[PDB]
Amino acid sequence: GIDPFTKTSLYESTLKNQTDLLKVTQSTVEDFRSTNQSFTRALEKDIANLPYQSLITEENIINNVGPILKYYRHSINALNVYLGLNNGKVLLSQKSMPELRDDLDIKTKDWYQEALKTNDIFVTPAYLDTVLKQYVITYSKAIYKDGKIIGVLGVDIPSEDLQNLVAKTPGNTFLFDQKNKIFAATNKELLNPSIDHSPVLNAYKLNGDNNFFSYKLNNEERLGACTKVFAYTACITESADIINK
Amino acid sequence: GIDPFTKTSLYESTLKNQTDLLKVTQSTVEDFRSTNQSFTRALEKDIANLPYQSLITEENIINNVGPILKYYRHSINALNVYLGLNNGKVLLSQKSAKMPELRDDLDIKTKDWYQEALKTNDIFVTPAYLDTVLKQYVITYSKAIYKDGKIIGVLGVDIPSEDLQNLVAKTPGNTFLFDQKNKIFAATNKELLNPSIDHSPVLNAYKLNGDNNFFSYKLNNEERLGACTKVFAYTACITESADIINKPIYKA
Ligand SMILES: CC[C@H](C)[C@H](N)C(=O)O
Numbered sequence: 001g002i003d004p005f006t007k008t009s010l011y012e013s014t015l016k017n018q019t020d021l022l023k024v025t026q027s028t029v030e031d032f033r034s035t036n037q038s039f040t041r042a043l044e045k046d047i048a049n050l051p052y053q054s055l056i057t058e059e060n061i062i063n064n065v066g067p068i069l070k071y072y073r074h075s076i077n078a079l080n081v082y083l084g085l086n087n088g089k090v091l092l093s094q095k096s097m098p099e100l101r102d103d104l105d106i107k108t109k110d111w112y113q114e115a116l117k118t119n120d121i122f123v124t125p126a127y128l129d130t131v132l133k134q135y136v137i138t139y140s141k142a143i144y145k146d147g148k149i150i151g152v153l154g155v156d157i158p159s160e161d162l163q164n165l166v167a168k169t170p171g172n173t174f175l176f177d178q179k180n181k182i183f184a185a186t187n188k189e190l191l192n193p194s195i196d197h198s199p200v201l202n203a204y205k206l207n208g209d210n211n212f213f214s215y216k217l218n219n220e221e222r223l224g225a226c227t228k229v230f231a232y233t234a235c236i237t238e239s240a241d242i243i244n245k
Numbered sequence: 246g247i248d249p250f251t252k253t254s255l256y257e258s259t260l261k262n263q264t265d266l267l268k269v270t271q272s273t274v275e276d277f278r279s280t281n282q283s284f285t286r287a288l289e290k291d292i293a294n295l296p297y298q299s300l301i302t303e304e305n306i307i308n309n310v311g312p313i314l315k316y317y318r319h320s321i322n323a324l325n326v327y328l329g330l331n332n333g334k335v336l337l338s339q340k341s342a343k344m345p346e347l348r349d350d351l352d353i354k355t356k357d358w359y360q361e362a363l364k365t366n367d368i369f370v371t372p373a374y375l376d377t378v379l380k381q382y383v384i385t386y387s388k389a390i391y392k393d394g395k396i397i398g399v400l401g402v403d404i405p406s407e408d409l410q411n412l413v414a415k416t417p418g419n420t421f422l423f424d425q426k427n428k429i430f431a432a433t434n435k436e437l438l439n440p441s442i443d444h445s446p447v448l449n450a451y452k453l454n455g456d457n458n459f460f461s462y463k464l465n466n467e468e469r470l471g472a473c474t475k476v477f478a479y480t481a482c483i484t485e486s487a488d489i490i491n492k493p494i495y496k497a
């Protein structure tokens with residue numbers, strides 16, 4: 001758009017605009033995670049606050065912890081909320097009275113194993129829930145009372161919840177998961193698994209977090225930026241027509 | 246005549262972005278409301294799921310409803326979660342350890358959160374007001390609870406209005422909210438909250454223009470551009486200096 005002064009003004013403007021919108025998508029991901037972490041932490045505290053007598057028999061776990069799992073599940077509309085024990089049983093409150101299940105192979109599960117290896121909440125990649133066969137993100141936390149492990153708390157939130165939040169955001173924003181597979185997008189057509197993303201991904205590796213870049217699609221110029229948000233990569237892209245016309 | 250800058254692609258995109266940022270603030274308000282409404286509905290359902298016999302004596306209400314109020318309060322970090330009864334007593338869960346107890350001196354039957362809930366099938370959302378007990382500004386979500394068609398009481402959930410302010414403050418853009426009385430309520434630039442700020446120019450211009458339509462206005466002899474929109478009872482606005490919208494080659 002010929003005069004370099006004018007092109008620079010258009011470029012600097014769209015850079016700021018697109019960076020702002022990328023930040024909104026970043027914030028969406030952050031807020032989803034923190035809300036779920038706060039919820040999980042509160043549940044941990046309510047369980048650990050029970051007297052040991054209420055925690056040390058399986059029947060007492062069912063009768064005393066079960067209602068807490070159920071109310072918490074309902075309060076945020078979680079898919080499953082549960083407490084896994086070292087005997088391999090798990091008290092499960094599932095969307096459909098919490099029951100003690102012995103058939104869920106919990107010690108083979110990352111949500112269980114990993115919670116025992118950190119003092120933080122553990123957040124799983126999205127995976128297909130065994131019980132309800134929906135894709136979930138699990139927040140898990142080893143619960144201790146007086147330094148004594150009670151069990152591992154788990155909270156399953158449908159990954160579609162995050163996908164829907166991201167899709168509603170302004171801008172042509174999208175998320176890749178930890179394996180660089182498309183996870184969420186404002187334009188639902190981007191969900192085609194056969195779409196190649198090397199151009200934006202290569203541009204991102206060259207430029208780094210939040211650094212605006214140009215790239216090509218079918219010999220046409222586009223502009224974009226990406227940034228790491230936990231294990232995700234969040235991106236925004238647009239046509240470069242805004243600066244070239 | 247017409248400002249030539251308004252015919253530029255730069256101006257057009259600038260307004261498109263301001264519109265996008267205003268919509269982010271609109272979404273913030275909508276999502277805060279929806280989340281709190283859903284929480285309150287879930288709580289109602291769990292209370293009403295108690296057997297009728299558990300809901301009809303004060304002792305049974307304390308013992309059976311109280312734990313539910315507490316666990317729900319913790320789950321979302323609400324300020325107060327409570328069940329108001331027709332006898333005027335209220336089972337109140339708030340920060341203080343012990344189990345929820347009945348308070349008999351909170352004058353509930355003449356309060357809007359109570360009376361409005363009885364007039365509707367819906368959740369009632371109050372304008373922000375100073376909480377009677379903890380003296381923080383709160384928004385209350387209330388709902389009449391029925392069991393087998395019989396009124397048990399009115400559920401209330403108090404969320405500090407500061408929670409919504411904090412959400413708005415984190416949003417991009419110079420966005421802000423007015424309440425139902427056209428008083429400043431939340432702002433990205435927390436200086437806009439100070440009572441000495443004159444919001445008449447933006448409000449007067451908004452009245453002439455309607456939702457999402459950009460307008461010029463002035464404050465303290467500075468030309469500005471703004472747009473506002475209704476979001477439930479609130480008015481959400483975004484404004485910018487005219488000299489940022491159109492950066493002069495020579496500054497004044
Ligand atoms: C109780 C564990 C639950 C079912 C978890 N989502 C899993 O699939 O392992």
Ligand SMILES: CC[C@H](C)[C@H](N)C(=O)O
Binds near residue numbers: 335337351375383401
């Ligand atoms: C139990 C009612 C509570 C305190 C409510 N926030 C009020 O001020 O009326």
